[PDB]
Amino acid sequence: MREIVHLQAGQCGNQIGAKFWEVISDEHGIDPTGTYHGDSDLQLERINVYYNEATGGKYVPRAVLVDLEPGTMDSVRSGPFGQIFRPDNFVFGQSGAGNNWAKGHYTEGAELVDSVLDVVRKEAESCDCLQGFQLTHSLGGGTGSGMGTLLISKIREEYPDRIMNTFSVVPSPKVSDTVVEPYNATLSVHQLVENTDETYCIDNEALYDICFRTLKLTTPTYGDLNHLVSATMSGVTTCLRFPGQLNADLRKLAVNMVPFPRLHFFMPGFAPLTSRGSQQYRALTVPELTQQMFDAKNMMAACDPRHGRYLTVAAVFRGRMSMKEVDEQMLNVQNKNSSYFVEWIPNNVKTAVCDIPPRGLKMSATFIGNSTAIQELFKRISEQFTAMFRRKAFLHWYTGEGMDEMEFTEAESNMNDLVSEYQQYQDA
Amino acid sequence: QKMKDKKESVYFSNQRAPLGKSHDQTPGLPKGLDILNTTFGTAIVRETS
Amino acid sequence: MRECISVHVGQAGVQIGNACWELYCLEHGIQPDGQMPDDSFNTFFSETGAGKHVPRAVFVDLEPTVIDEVRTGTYRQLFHPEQLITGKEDAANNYARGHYTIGKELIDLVLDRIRKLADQCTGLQGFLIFHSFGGGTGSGFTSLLMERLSVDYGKKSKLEFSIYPAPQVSTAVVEPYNSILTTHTTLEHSDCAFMVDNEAIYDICRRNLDIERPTYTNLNRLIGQIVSSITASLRFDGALNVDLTEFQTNLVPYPRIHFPLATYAPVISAEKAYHEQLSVAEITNACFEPANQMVKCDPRHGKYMACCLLYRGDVVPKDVNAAIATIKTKRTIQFVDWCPTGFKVGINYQPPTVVPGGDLAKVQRAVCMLSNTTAIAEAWARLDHKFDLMYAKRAFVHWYVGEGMEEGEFSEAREDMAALEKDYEEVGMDSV
Amino acid sequence: MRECISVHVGQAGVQIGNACWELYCLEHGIQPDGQMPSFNTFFSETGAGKHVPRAVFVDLEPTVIDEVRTGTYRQLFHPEQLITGKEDAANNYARGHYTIGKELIDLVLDRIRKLADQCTGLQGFLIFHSFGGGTGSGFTSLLMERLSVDYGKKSKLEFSIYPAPQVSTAVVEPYNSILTTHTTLEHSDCAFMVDNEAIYDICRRNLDIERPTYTNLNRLIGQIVSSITASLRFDGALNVDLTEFQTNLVPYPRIHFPLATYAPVISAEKAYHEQLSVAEITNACFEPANQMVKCDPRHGKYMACCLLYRGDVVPKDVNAAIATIKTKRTIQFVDWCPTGFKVGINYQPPTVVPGGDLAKVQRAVCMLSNTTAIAEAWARLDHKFDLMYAKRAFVHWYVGEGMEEGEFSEAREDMAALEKDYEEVGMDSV
Ligand SMILES: Nc1nc2c(ncn2[C@@H]2O[C@H](COP(=O)(O)OP(=O)(O)OP(=O)(O)O)[C@@H](O)[C@H]2O)c(=O)[nH]1
Ligand SMILES: Nc1nc2c(ncn2[C@@H]2O[C@H](COP(=O)(O)OP(=O)(O)OP(=O)(O)O)[C@@H](O)[C@H]2O)c(=O)[nH]1
């Protein structure tokens, strides 16, 4: 009764959204046929957060797989846990679209959206206490972060206080996997910052260096980094399905987290991860894990924490702990690190301690920080529009459908409106 | 007679360069033609990790 | 279901198009008679109820000597005999005899076959035409087949791969005439019009290989693989896959620039791949060594605008971006300033596949690179200095006059290539 | 780990290169076709298990490279490294640097790009050459000026063969060994030098070998370069890197020409009866007889002496062996270097190559010495340049292939400065 309605969109979010259901179903004892196999008691009694229940003693997810190109949905139907879903809500079409924002909100995504949202309407109007949404997308293309604004715009027209929980993969600094990426990423910032409340921003570059340094993996493929993102997926949902000593829903993890209505972007992180060689050599505690939470390397989005002050760090703990150790050792990280937190907030941290941790170690953790230092992510992308815009580069596709240059100038300021306010509030 | 002329006598001259065939690669490549010869297996990394 | 329509016009593109369907049926299990002893192959093929498999390509050329070697040849048991359109007498290599006079006859027949195939198709993605520049029926005819599709159909991409006229060698006289006819028409409705040349494949064949005297046969298999490393992202599921319509936007910066180059990286024999180490960090800059390329040109006088490194085979994506930034830190690989880090990747899980009897070795990896470059305008400078010297004396006009060409349209097309020469000198300049 | 790239030029170096890789393989455990039935410094590795060495061979004649593509070692090298021109440099610095050289210098450099773009940490280019003729001296001159410009600061070490005081196989050889100083002065960092005729008398008195070919002289030089690169591949009590050498051996940057000596060079029939302790073969390096260059050490003074010991050696026997040398009076040391020496120890003993004439010995010393007394060896080499260039003899060939006439006399005064830069430091300061 702290519910979440799920969706997938784009190629990048479809995979990690599919690799969401690998992690959550192992926690809860479900078999892909839908038989409860877990021996522990507590896996069942809050299962309706993410799941409907199927008639005949069987279990079934609560999500809608959609994207415009049909290879990916047909790839997951042949996947590991493909046969769990409901076959009426696969809105997949054989047709395609060429990463253009214009057609996907005015012509080619307009035919699709009623069939898209009438099953987000179905699973919600037969619900008890709906509380949030979960849409896995990525910031770049005309299909991922194009359609992220399509599947959020008509929602807030009716839902008054429901808290959306999306997850977005940012453009990396050094490399590129789309030429026309600033020309489509800032196009969604016109609507997402108005409406989203959680976007777990992710760099692809920082995901490799955790694998290179801590994990000592030379070759992190795509079977790795989804399984690294997937921990902070089901790490924030500990006080939504489990008992615990300090409980909070997605709203309390917004009233604490959100200070002003447009600075609401979350940085992931999973503490007790180590390579196989030095795993015996390392002994973990509540003092030891709090290093790996507050380490400079265990952040899935690459920024420099030593170039900004944290607004609200909220690290969720999971397992059996001492809770002086929770509070005395999350002040020692604030006392010793003085100038790198805001002076106009007296206590900058908040814990959350659970009673059953996710599987893999005794004493798991997950650290979520809302810094100020992610303006350097914002500076580069907003620069990459305007210094490429001094020649009027790619407008002859989008102006076939009415994407005038009066739009693309003013949405760049709505990126730089965010830059001006971190500079307004870094020196306060 | 064409086979005898182009096999016995004519083998000495054009042995370096044929028409659409590269060379007599057999004395150089100590392998088999059906074997797989690249840099290395990344399946080694896949099995290790 | 993601399908594609092929046409092959002219003995340049037909004979390479004969050289592609071996490589497509050798990936799968289909024998030449069409019986396969899977929902992937619907890109290029189809199925009839006897277990036979039937392709998606139509073969047409006015001269009948190269289509009739296939019907008599060992590959007739594959196609549709109503697709194979033969003819009477060719176009004199003369534009108004591939377009205006003799070219007109077979058109309503042939355009009712891109109509027939697509009417039983689910959702279509583009075309795979195969022509060449300096022809007279490889230029006049494919002009007319391109102004009838998109005028009638509309909003679908076009993917033909031509052969550039070399700046040194050629096998006609009337080719500086003949080029400026098909680069009028590829400018006004073609959206992805690739190219290679006959000359650079000769000199890959000397250094990377060691095959002196390259025939016609060994050239066409290499041009098959570049296509079959591009077009095999529509039948193979992979980590990073791109639609045909999706690179109709991200490549073309301004309407004019849609002619990039191509490069297959580990072209090698069995006696060097046994020695060489061809892993990911060195077969990705071999596409930027000045040797391995498909125009006899100097790359270092140009800046590579939008490189789309399509990989395939057994690779992992840490090894890509470690090697992507290794290029831009190198000072020799100079880029366009205003565009971003221009690189662009794509990974699949299907190896190179060797058609037997060739000189190509078994490698576990392959890179196809599509590189828009500044360095092609110099080759476009030479092909009008090859043109105007005729037109100072007005040589050979009277045959084109004899079939329907005016005098003045040879200057209309040259100022239209003054328009394409001036664009690389107004977008290659620095924006300040 | 740490890597080194080897390039051999000319008739001298390529013949030297086949002698060292006959013994570099036998240090390790690989068959000569590159197969095996810590050494990552010199061999890259395909997944199949072929040991490809790091080498770019070059010559302007096919007649010395074609016995590598057809010899036993054809399976070892990658056949895109054996660089081969069309016609020789005709023993001309004019042809080997100006006319014939600039058709291959794109390919030779862009191969060196392709061996250095996969090594982890690169520190030394074992370039091999000679001061005899055209390609050995002149192509190395263009080869240096393209490496250091395009690579920067990675330290090179060259090995050379010097013209003898009397005994040589050329006429115009002073015209190529004065003009080659304009490329081993500036860009190359050290140049380890042995002249040919001094090896010959060592091959007559110590080894009782009459009529030695160019194989036995190439085996002996094989056991010096392998002694330099022991500390790269086999861990020891005191290892010495390549960057260790150049700041421990060169006083002033126009003086990099150290000599070489090998101590236990004795035959198999007399090795049994003599034990070779390190108190007696330390003396055997400093003999005027056993020196592998004919410049008399007791004419002048010693500058700085580097030692390299291989095998069953204990360190305080070495320090007892060092201090007994400074206390003598005939071994004259330079006045302002009280330190005098530099040492090195490694555990793997020297390994005899089959068909070799050296004996299997548990101890060995490599020796390096800047001397003040090789200044006479430049005194008779500028004279043999002075004798012919009085009447402009033989210059009409080099001039017509792209040289000016003043370029020859520009090099003689530059060699007049180097003899004075090497004699002004010889006086004891006061
Ligand atoms: N790659 C390849 N190119 C070819 C082949 N045969 C001819 N060509 C090229 O085709 C060019 C001539 O232009 P084409 O377009 O083929 O002439 P055409 O318009 O087709 O007219 P036809 O004579 O009927 O074939 C020559 O310069 C050749 O380089 C071939 O078998 N393979
Ligand atoms: N130590 C040693 N010196 C050699 C050997 N062979 C030749 N030399 C020297 O090489 C000098 C002649 O120069 P080379 O390098 O052999 O000939 P070149 O200038 O390269 O001319 P080409 O070989 O025809 O290209 C002579 O003075 C010899 O002293 C050898 O096997 N060992």
Ligand SMILES: Nc1nc2c(ncn2[C@@H]2O[C@H](COP(=O)(O)OP(=O)(O)O)[C@@H](O)[C@H]2O)c(=O)[nH]1
């Ligand atoms: N982690 C992960 N990232 C992916 C995957 N597929 C694509 N991406 C990322 O998606 C980015 C490109 O933007 P994209 O999501 O494709 O835009 P879209 O075409 O609308 O989906 C690239 O930088 C990739 O890193 C995947 O399977 N796993």
Ligand SMILES: [Mg+2]
């Ligand atoms: Mg023809």
Ligand SMILES: [Mg+2]
């Ligand atoms: Mg020589």
